[PDB]
DNA sequence: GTCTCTATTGTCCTGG
DNA sequence: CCAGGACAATAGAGAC
């Protein structure tokens, strides 16, 4: 079972694909270290809608793995 | 040609 | 309790 996404990595998930589109050139950190940065710079108000739909996947998760418990490892 | 690493934020879990 | 990890997506780039 894989984790739910949260709201970076929602709104991660399209503008990578953005900025891979608008830049073929850069390297795939280099896209990590920019979605890190215009996240910062994203108003609060701006992220809402990713964080609204991050729940919906949380809770959508919630539905179809009921005995889910996050399990890491060492 | 086939693995491993890379680098980000947010959210959960777990060793002192 | 709390500071430091795991792992969510991602696909091309280096290693051998």
């Given amino acids: 079972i894989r984790r739910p996404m949260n709201a970076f990595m929602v709104w991660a998930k399209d503008e990578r694909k ?3 589109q608008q ?8 896209l990590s270290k920019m979605l890190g940065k215009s996240w910062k710079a994203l108003t ?5 809608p990713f964080v609204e739909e991050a729940e919906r996947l949380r809770v959508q998760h919630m539905q179809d793995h009921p005995n889910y418990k996050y399990r890491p490892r060492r």
């Fill in 18 to 20: 953005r900025l891979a």
């Fill in 23 to 30: 830049n073929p050139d850069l390297h795939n950190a280099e």
């Fill in 44 to 48: 609060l108000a701006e992220k809402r």
